[PDB]
Each structure stands twice: as C-alpha cells, then as structure tokens.
Design a protein around this nucleic acid. Sequence first.
DNA 1: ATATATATATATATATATATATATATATAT
DNA 2: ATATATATATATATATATATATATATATAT
Lengths: 198, 212, 246, 99, 233, 134, 335, 94
Amino acid sequence: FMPVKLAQALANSLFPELDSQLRAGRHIGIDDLDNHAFLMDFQEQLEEFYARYNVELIRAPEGFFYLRPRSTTLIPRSVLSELDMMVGKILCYLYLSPERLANQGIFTSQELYEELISLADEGKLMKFVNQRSSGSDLDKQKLQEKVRTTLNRLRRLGMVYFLPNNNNKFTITEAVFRFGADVRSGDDPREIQLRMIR
Amino acid sequence: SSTHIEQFMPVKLAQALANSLFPELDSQLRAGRHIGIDDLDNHAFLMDFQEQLEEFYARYNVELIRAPEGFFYLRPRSTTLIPRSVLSELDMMVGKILCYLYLSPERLANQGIFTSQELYEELISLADEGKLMKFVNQRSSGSDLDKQKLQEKVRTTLNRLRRLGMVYFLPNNNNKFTITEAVFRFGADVRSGDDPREIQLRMIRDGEAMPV
Amino acid sequence: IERGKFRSLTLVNWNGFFARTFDLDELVTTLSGGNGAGKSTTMAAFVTALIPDLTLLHFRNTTEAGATSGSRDKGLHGKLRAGVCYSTLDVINSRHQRVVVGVRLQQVAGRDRKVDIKPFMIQGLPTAIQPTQLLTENVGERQARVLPLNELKDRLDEMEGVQFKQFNSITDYHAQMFDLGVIPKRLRSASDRSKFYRLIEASLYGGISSAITRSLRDYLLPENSGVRKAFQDMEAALRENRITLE
Amino acid sequence: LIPDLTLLHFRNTTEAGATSGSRDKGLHGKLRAGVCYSTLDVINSRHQRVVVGVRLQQVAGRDRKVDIKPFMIQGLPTAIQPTQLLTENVGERQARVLP
Amino acid sequence: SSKSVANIIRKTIQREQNRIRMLNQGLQAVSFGQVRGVRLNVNVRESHAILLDVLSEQQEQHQDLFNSQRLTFSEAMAKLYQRLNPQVDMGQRLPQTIGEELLDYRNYLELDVEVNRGSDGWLKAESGALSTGEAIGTGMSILVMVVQSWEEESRRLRGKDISPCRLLFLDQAARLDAKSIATLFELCERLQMQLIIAAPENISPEKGTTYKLVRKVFKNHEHVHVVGLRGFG
Amino acid sequence: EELLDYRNYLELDVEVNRGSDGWLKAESGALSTGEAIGTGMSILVMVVQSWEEESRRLRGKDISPCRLLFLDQAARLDAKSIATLFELCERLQMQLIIAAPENISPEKGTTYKLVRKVFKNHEHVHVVGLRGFG
Amino acid sequence: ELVSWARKNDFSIEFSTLRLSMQLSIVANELHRAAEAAEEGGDEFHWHRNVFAPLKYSVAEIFDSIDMSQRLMDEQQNFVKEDIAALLNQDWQAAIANCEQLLSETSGTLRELQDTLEAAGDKLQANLLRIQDANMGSGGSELVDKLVFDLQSKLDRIISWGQQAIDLWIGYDRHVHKFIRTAIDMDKNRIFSQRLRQSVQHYFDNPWTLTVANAERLLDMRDEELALRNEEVTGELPLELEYEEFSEINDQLAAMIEKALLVYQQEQRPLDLGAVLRDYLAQHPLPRHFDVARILVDQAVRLGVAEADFSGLPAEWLAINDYGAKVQAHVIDTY
Amino acid sequence: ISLPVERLAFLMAIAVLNSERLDGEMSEGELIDAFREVCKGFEQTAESVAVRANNAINDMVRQKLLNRFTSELADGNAIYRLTPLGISISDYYI
DNA sequence: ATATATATATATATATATATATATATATAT
DNA sequence: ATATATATATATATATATATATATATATAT
Ligand SMILES: Nc1ncnc2c1ncn2[C@@H]1O[C@H](COP(=O)(O)OP(=O)(O)OP(=O)(O)O)[C@@H](O)[C@H]1O
Ligand SMILES: [Mg+2]
C-alpha cells in the first residue's frame, strides 16, 4: 500500500503547485508561509516520495527546502552556466548587513552589474561573453542582456523576487545562502565570500 | 475511520502511484513522451489504472488523453500547471512523413527499420525541395552546403521526436529506427473527412494544435 | 618475426624522480634498494602510462593486495609532485619504428587527492633524441625545466618528420597503441580495459589473483555470438508460445 | 596456540585478506594420516615447565576435516623432551606415535 | 529452436575443448618449489550435459515450467536446472542471475588449473594448499598462457608484420628463491616475455640489466639516485 | 548502545613522521611495503602491551605473560628495517619467529635451515640448526 | 593485406527442388566413392588420383552449385517481396488475398528446400567424417584434411542458411500481416492516405502545430571548476649512470667447500656436521665464521639424510668453536 | 555495373570474409568494418567513413551485387549476402 | 570547428540479510 | 558414570541492492 500521511500530503490541494515548482528546482523558504508550513509538516513523507525519484528533499540550515538530483535522478536534470553561479554568489554577498542601510532589501540590476564588473576578473567575463572580446560596447551590451537572462533564471528558482514591474529591481531571499560559503568561528562573512568569489 | 486511505485518496489510485513503474512513467509523460503499444509494461500500467491517472493529472490542469489508436499522452490546458510547447513546422513535416512511412507499403521490405537517409529522400520526394529549404536558410537556392544543413536539421528533428516516443532507435544503432503508432497524431487534421479549415478550428479549440 | 620491445621508461617530476630514464632490458630489468626506495613508484608510473584509465588505477600495498582498505584514495595523487609530470614509453615496433607513447599527469587543486591524465603519442622521433631531454627545456645553468603539453606540441611541430598526436579518449589511445603492436588485445570496450588492467595488476602483485582464477573462463575462452543468437531465437519462440497460451 | 577450527584459516600469503575462493581452510592437507601432535613448551615467570599441546586427526570422511583435542602437562622433568613422550622407540627403524 | 540451441552450444563447446587441449602442450614442465608442471583442465560439466540433453530431446516434457507467467526465461532455465540434477545444491544466489549465467556457453565447461605437485600427480590448484613461491609461479604461468591466447585471437585483425610487445611485472621478488627465479627467467626468455622485477636485495645478479635506487633527504625534500649494477668486477 | 560505550567517544588514529614531512595519518595506500609492515608490527606490539597492562590487575603480581610474534615473507624488508625490528623486539623482551627464503642472514639468534627431500617414498624436511653467532 | 593487392591490380569497371535433389544425389555418389577409395588405400599416386583430383574438384564445384541455387532462391525471395510491395500499391484492400497466397507459396517453397537440404546433410556429414578417418593413411595427405575440414563448413553453412532464411522470412511474413492488420484495417478505402499525402503537399497553406507537455528541467548547481597545479618545476638533470660490480667471494668460498665436501659423498663416509664445522671454521677469522657455517650447511644437507631424525631422539647443540657458536644436527648416514 | 577500385576492393574483401565466414552470413556490422578497412588502405577521404560505407552498400544492393535482409537482432540490424552476379564478378579474379 | 551539456554503462565500495559451520552447555540414552 | 544429540550463540562469507565516480558517444550552440 502507501503511507497514510504520504497520501494526506499528496492529496492536499497545495501539492500540485509545490510539486511543479520543486521539480522545476525552485527553493521554498520561510517567506512562502503556506508552502513552508506544509513542507515542515510533511517532510518525513515527501523525502521518501522524492527519494523514489532518486532525488533528495533537503532542508537547508537556513531552513529553505529544495530538491537535489542524484546521478540516477529521474527528473530531467540541468546545470547552471558559469555566469549563473557567479551571479548567485554576487547576490549571496549582497545579502549583507550594511545592505540594510544600503538598499533596505531592494536592489536594482545596475547594482549587480557594477558589482560583477568591478569584482570579477576580466578573463571570466570574456569567457562568459566571448574570448576575443576586449572592453567593447557590443560585448558589454550582450553581457548585460545575459545578466538579465540569468537574473530571470534565478527568479525561476525563487532566488530573487522581482518587484512587480517591467523594470529590473528586486529583492534577495535567504535561500541565496546556497551560493554562500561555510561560516567558521570568528570569520568575517564578507572576507570568506570574497575569497570564494576570487 | 481515521488513518484510512479512503479518507484522502481512492485505493486504486494510491496503489497505482505506489507501483514501481509510476515514477519513470510520470517523468517521461511530463517530459512530453508519448506511450505506444511497444512499451508493453508501461502501456499495460496506463491501461489498468487509466482513470485514476486522468483524474490525478487533472489536478495539474492537463488531460491524460488516449487517442483512438491506443497511445496515451498529456495535453496541457490554457491553465496548465505544467508548461506547454508546440512542435516546429519541420517537426510536422517529419512527423507527417513518418506517418506515411508507417502506412506506406512500398517500404515494407524494410520491415519497419528505417534510416535517416531514406526518410530524407522520401521527404524531398513528397515536399517542395527548395521551398522547404527556404525555412532552413532564408538565402538558400540549392547550395549543397545548405543541403547538408537541411539534412542535419532533419536528423536533429528526428532525434527530438525520438525523445517524444514517436520513434525508437535500435538497441545498438542510433542511425536506424522503428516507428511507433504515436506518429498517427500528426494526421489528426485529416483523420476526419471534412473541410480542412473547420477541422483546424476544432483542433485548435480543443487545444490539440496551435497555429504559427 | 622480430617482436617489438620496450626500450626505456621515463619519469618526470615524480615523487623523488625529477627526470629519470631507466633503459629497460631485452629480457629482464631488476630494481633494487632498501624499503621505500621507490620501485613500486616506478611500476605504478609505467602502468599508468599503459592504462591511463583513472577508474582502474588503484595502487594498494602489496600487503592487503585486493583486501579493501577503505582509504578512499587510489594512491596515485601522493605519488606525483605539484605541477606537470610525465610518464612515457619508447617502443621499438616489429616494423623497427621508434614510437614514444606517454601521458601527462597533473594534480588537481583541492582537498580531494584527484589527478588529471592526458595521453599522447609521438612517431618518427629521431633515435638520437632522448625523451628526458625532449620533455625538458634547458633553462639556466644546467638547470633544465619541464614544459607543458602546449609547449611540447610547439617544440615537436617545429621539428621535421615527427608526428605528435593528443588523444581525447583513452579508447583511441589504446586503439593506436594496438595498431602499432604494443597491446596484445584490442580494448574496444571498457570490459576489455578492465580485464587488461586485471592481468597487469595481478602480475604486479604477482601470484594467483582471486578475480583472475574466478573468471578464468572469461579470460581464456572467447565470446561467441552464435549461441547468443540461438538463445534469443528460443526466447522469442517461448514468448510467442506464452502469448498464445495466455 | 589457538585450537579453534572456526578461526584457523591458512590461506596463502598472497591473498592475505581476500575471500576464501575455495571452501578448504588449508589445514587438513598439512597433516598426515593417523594421530599427530603440536606442542609448545613454556617456562613461566614462576619457572614451571608446562607442555601445552593439541592432538590432531584427519577426520575420515567425504570432506577434508580435522579433529583437535587440547591438553596440558605439568610437572614434567626437564630431562625429557616432548618427542620422547609422544613417540615409542620401538625396535623398528622409525618410532611409533602413540594416541 | 531449443534443439538448434543445444546443438550450437555442443559444437562450440567441442571446438573450445579442442583448442584448449591443443594449447595445453605449450607448457614445458616449469620447476617451482614442489610444483613440477602446470596444466589447464577443460571438461564438459555433466550437470550441464544433462541439461543440454533435456533441451535437445525433452523440451516439451517440462513445458509446464517454461510457460509460467511468474518465471522469465532466465528464471525458467534456472528452475529447470534445479529440477534435474538436484544434488548440486547451489547457494543463496537468486534464480535470475544463475539463469543468466546458464545462458553463457563458457559456463558449461569446468576450466581449472592443475599442478603436478611433487609425486602426487595432477591436483587442482588451490591457493590454500600451495606455498607462496608455488602460487607465484602458477600465477605467472596462468598469466603467460592468457597473454598468449589474447595474442593468438588477435592474429587475424593485426597485420602480418607486427608481433605485439610482451611485458609483465613482479614486485617483492624476494619471495622467490634462486631456483624459482631461474625457472621464471628461462620461461620468459623462451616465450620472449619481458619482465620487470623488484626486490630489496639484488636477487638476479647475473642476468638482464639491474639498477639500484637510493632515496636521499635533501634540503627538506627528496631525491632518488639511480646507479647501474654489473655482474662481475 | 554504541553511545553507552566510552570507547566510542574516542577517535583513534595512527600517525607516522614520514621523512621530511610532519606527522601524517597512516594510510596503507601512501606507504611502501616495508613501511606498512613495520607500522603494523609497531601497532601489534602496542596492542600486546595494552592487553598485558589491562590483564595485570587480575593476575598474580609475579606473572609476566609470554610475548611472541611472527613475520612471514620477511624478505620484503631490508637489512636496516630488520635490524630496527630486532632492536624493538629486544627492547620489549618480545620473541620473534621470522621466515625468509635464505635471502637474509640475521647473525643474532637461532637459525634453522630446512630442505625438503623424498625419503622412503615420503616427503621429509631435513632440518639443521645454528645459534650463538655474534 | 589484400587491400594493397587490389590497389596494385588497378582493376575496375532455377528454383526447382528436383534440381537440388539431383545435385545432392550426384554428390552422394561421388562422396561415397571417394570415401571408399580412400578407405581402401594405396600409394601416393593412388591416394592422389582417388582423393585429390576426383574429390576436390567435383565436391567444390557441386557445393558451389548448391550454394548458387540457394542464392537464386534468395533472388526469388527478393523479387516476390518487390512484387507484393508493388501489388499493395495498386489494389490496397483487394490485394490482401494475392499477398497471402504469394506468402504461402514462398513459405512452402522455403520449407521444401530446407527439407531437401536436411534430406542428405546428415549422411554427407557421416561420409565426410569417414573420409577424415581414412585420410590419415598417408603422411602426404595433409591437403586432403583441409578439404575434409573445409568441405565440412560449406555443407553445414548451406544447411544453416536453409533454416536462417526461413527464420528471416517467417519473420518478414508476420510484418506483412501486421501491416495488413494495421495499415489497411483503419484505412480500408485508403482515403486517409491520399488526404495525408495532399496535406503534406499543401501543409504550409494551413501551417499548424501540435501541443506537448514541456515541463521544466531541474536546474542544478554546477560543480566547482577543477584547477590543476602549475608551479613550473625545475631541477638538476641526472648525470650519466655510474656502475658497481658484485663481489664473488662467496662463490669462491662455496666452490672451495663443495670440493672439500664431495669426498664424503664419494666415499659415503658418515658426515658429522659438528666436527666438520669445528675443523673448517678454524681456517677463517671469527667475523666471517657465520657466512661460512651457513654455506657449509647448504652444501652438506644436499648430501643424503640423517637416519636418526626418525628416532624421536632430539640431537644436542654441539659447540663448533669458541665465543659460543653451536650446531644442532644428527649424523648424515643415508646417502 | 560500375565498380571503381574502392568498390571492387570492398567486394573482394566481402567475398574473402564470406569464404572464411563460418555459416555464410554477413551482418552489415562487419560490412561497415570491411569498408572502413578498405578505404583506410586506399587512403582517400571524400566524406566520413559511415556515409561512404552506406552509399557503397546501397549502390551495390541496387546494382545487383548484394541482397539485404532486415533482422533486428543482427549486428547492425541487417544481414547481407552476395548475389549471383556478385559471386561471379568476385570469383572471376579469385 | 569545437567547447559544453546530457544520457548511458561499467567498476568499485558500503551496508544489510542470511545460510553454514563450529564451540559450549544441558539432556538423555548407554 | 559415560558419550551423543539438542539448542544456543557466534563468526564467517556469501549475495544483493545501493550509491558514487569515470569514460564514452554525441548531440547542440556559438
Ligand atoms: N601516494 C603516496 N603518498 C605519499 N608517499 C608516497 C606515496 N607513494 C609512495 N610514497 C612514498 O614514496 C617512497 C617510495 O614508495 P614506494 O612504494 O614506491 O617504494 P618501494 O621502492 O616500492 O618500496 P618497498 O620495496 O619497501 O615496497 C616511500 O617513502 C613511500 O612512502
Ligand atoms: Mg615497494
């Protein structure tokens, strides 16, 4: 047969949307009150249900839930670009404490663009756009467009909540800590994050 | 009573969802894969618990549909919880051609095993060579480089259809394949003997086919 | 016919060895030295040059030969120094052709003791050119330096008559070696590679390898496809009979 | 020292930790038909001369099995050697091992 | 179909037996310890000969087993092997895998290694009943025969002008005595086999080439110094 | 029940001061044959000493149990390692039985030359003994 | 190797079963005659003219003829497939009966050919084994064996095909029925087929596309990029190999001891290791004593055994010098 | 009937292998290998090995030199046999 | 034309269940 | 008063299923 509580969790009217978003890779944090509470309550059974797919339902130390595919994953897997992880680490850095006085939880695409240009090395930027490029207008425009595309991709994952409008200004969720590094006793988060990024 | 499956889910649907075959079938279906008679185990699984799965998938605003030919698949609705996508026009050409080969007796000697070269030859025989080539490249006029480009495009579309279950590569050969009854969907616009322009509207209304 | 021979073995930037070329013997080459001299290191380097498959390479101690030690480390990483390393074989073919096969090894930065291996081959090298010199650049006063694969390609291409190839897969590497009379069997499939490594591994530790004696049938007798075809025919017949009965 | 049939496995030095491969433990073929003995002589810190030992017999049967019977001897004179106790010096060329 | 199967298996088994029996005479009484010769014993397994006979003549009598919806073909073959010849007493291995094993012709031959230990005749070689040197010699004999077989099989694909290189290893050679090492040397040279041997002491002073390695700590790192050796001075 | 045992609360490792480098965890894969054999003998004598220490309090105050170890295929070790092993065993008053096929000739202690022959159609081991040399 | 031969050459540019039966009968007569001639025996010339000229040429030619008949049947199978394929294009629903008949006749013909082939395969094999047995009557009959090994396979090969073809055809046949059961059952009038063809020809006059589920792929975290270790290692290159030479002092000592000891074996004198060692060690300085003792023992134990070793009486540790050297060995009596 | 040097050499190799083949059957999996080997010997690369092999096999099949049979289990899912004209052309030289 | 992503297959080590053979204490026939 | 049969516990090692890592082919996209 089937576990009874597993049947209860699957039958819940919230299950279809949450299942689609999980299989899409989205991370469910504390912000999604209903979904987070549902996962908290029914984790013991959804872990088994998604282990039947050779996938792991992981609750991060920060608290947010997500799906990690194994090598034998039954859900078509995919891999983020290099620019995607770079941008993820940039946002993780920007989940900063002075951030509160800097942007009050609301950033704009320009902040991310300037941080990426100033902070990243030129070689990786060229590798992103193209090797033969060197500080040109067309290359920079293509880089900005790809930055917007990867920002949309992160939005798909729930990493970044867009402020509702065509304009690019958003907020950063705690799940971004996935890109972050481990914290040791007395380590400066800024220093470890920058050391990882470098 | 409490702690009782009927409280939340019918017994047969729960049994179907707990079967070892459910996960692979569900992942393939959501990926867009059609199911034919060849996948005996999966086809039988769908047949036995067919009704439970249509009602389960209805929760996603997608219809588990069995065409009269006997192949199951998923059709998302406008309010689908699972995204939706449409095949390319070249994909339609290759699918219609594949249906022809399924129904064509001239190639009976092949016994269902076909090579991409034969498929391309038949495609060019029945379609307009240069005017079909126009889509491959806007500036084509019969150049052999563009000819190879069209061959490669046909091969790529054939691979995608293989992903959709319309075609199976042979257990050891990726250059030869066997057709499946799912290809019959490419003829849904002509299976009914009526005016083409009314059947197209009927299908698009049913969500079977969007325009381009 | 004159059977080909392994002229020499060259070791570059290895643990203990900077650039050392042992000239092999026609029949027997012996290595002596107190414990920890580095003989096993030479054997490991050779076999790495022969079968660069990283999944197979596992340098267990002669003690616990085939006994799972759970170290999680194949032992190859600790046998190499930081930077580039090379392991090459000169072979005289039965066609009297001097061919230098080899591999570039390099430690992968990180906590994991992981290594990267890239095979390569050289044909037509003049008999007067020694691999030890060919792989190093004399920089400074009697202070030769090792050069990477790209520099080696540039140096060799500038020469006349020498053909250098770099393989993207150990499969083509083995195919080419077999083409030049270096390997007895054609290692087309990964199972063939596994059996080959099993043979050399049993030889290195010497004596009755449990896996060998357990699969002697697979190791000696060849595979037949006629029997498989007949069994498949019988399978189809039985399936049809069952369909009819049901 | 350790007369236990479960633990005694005289695998070859090669394959020192590898699986059995076969079913034999390698002890039976090291014995000869009849009654055999394996004995240690020990001098304690108290200087007591103690002869510990085991009597071995190839158990006649379908398989290659061995029967072991332990024993200890105390108070022996220092002038008598183990080979003398266990063997009769009959007039024949070779001695006779006694049960 | 079952009759044709059984026939082709029988023919393949006979051909392979003949090939291996012809190959056996490629050994010349190696001297290792008390082991005086090594041989390969190939014999059709009666437990499987009965199975072939049943398949070839009495397929129908056991159709009840074959046509059961519970058993796959491999499992059906395993159950049939169980039915007849019931004294083998196979272990805890599952029916599926044992059947799959039954589907390979090579399994039907007992292929074992015999040694003419001392004066006891030819006995099956078990690591548990052989000294270290004897086992090492036997393993080397097995490996040389295997490499010879591999060379022979590839004789067709290879060009007529190429003979593949031959090379083996032996670490911790000190486990072998002088007699065993001399026998190994004569075997390898008779078979044109190259050998790379290792031992803390120079165990082969008057044959082939020799090197001595010495490791020196040097300015907080290591260096190996290699010196050639010669038989006489 | 695992937590109920104090021993589980302890992490035990074997470290070796290998050459110029500091103390490294003893991995069977990162050592030569002789080094592994020697470290094994070291740990074995450690175990024997620990067992004697544990058992002393339940034994007569004037009882010192015998200590004796083996080493088969000793030829895998060089002369230096063998001398170090002999020194260790002597310092620990520990008896050794070492087998070597004539390759090594330890001058100290008893040596037993064995040779197998056929006599009266039976396998026989002719045995000769020497001792006191040195 | 034949590729170069071809390259240098520079060149470029009856299904009746009564036949098969008559070739089989002719083959049977000739093979039996040759086998009997071989069994009777004869000189080298007789062996030749009875087993190499008549057998070789005749059997080769007629087996090739039988194979040629099989190839002609293969051509006929191909032609009937093509005829069925063309017929189904012209009659569709009305050719079902024609195709079923053609399949029936082809299957019957194949079965009759297989029956005729197996009608004589076994006895021909028996006669060939008989010729194998009789071949060994002379040492120069090696070539005969080749034929007796070659003419085997062909025959069996032929028989194999006689079944294999049917195995193939009985397969293909099914497909045709499946086609009729699948392609034409739902397209009895074929109208769907023409309408599909015209849709293909005039598709782009109403270009339409189907809808399929395209669920998103589970984006994953890329594993960290792997960076190798680069340090530009440099160091001194090794000098030319030096050399060292092995001391044969022990060889000289062993030769000395073997010559000194061979007298005991020659005379069968009872050897006592104690006294011999005590006498002989006096000739060398103390530090070398051990290296002598060992060697001497190595030389002594090869000479016979000691009978006392079966008495159960342990031997004593006889001193063989000062400084405390001892030896334990019984007298060596049985040489 | 048109056999260039490469096609003729491939046909001769096919005939030799069939002569040395055990049961007188040729799957296309070996025909492709034979064409690769002959093309390698002739040292010419107009296109890929696979396309050249396929074109040559199809040309010989339509030129009445080979007969093809669809068998899925066979290596390459096809079995090829020399036709009487092919046998005659091959043995004319052999 | 080639970098890169994706699916598949194999070898390898871990962990658990289970059958086999032996050792030890007690029961019961001799 | 004895020795054999039983029940219990134990280690051995045998096999399966799992999970990981590497190599491969190859299909896409710039
Ligand atoms: N992976 C490794 N990591 C660290 N040290 C290593 C590694 N491999 C070898 N060594 C060290 O390198 C030296 C040579 O080792 P190696 O096993 O090659 O020696 P050897 O001559 O074969 O020794 P022996 O004959 O005693 O087995 C030894 O100090 C060994 O500890
Ligand atoms: Mg070593």
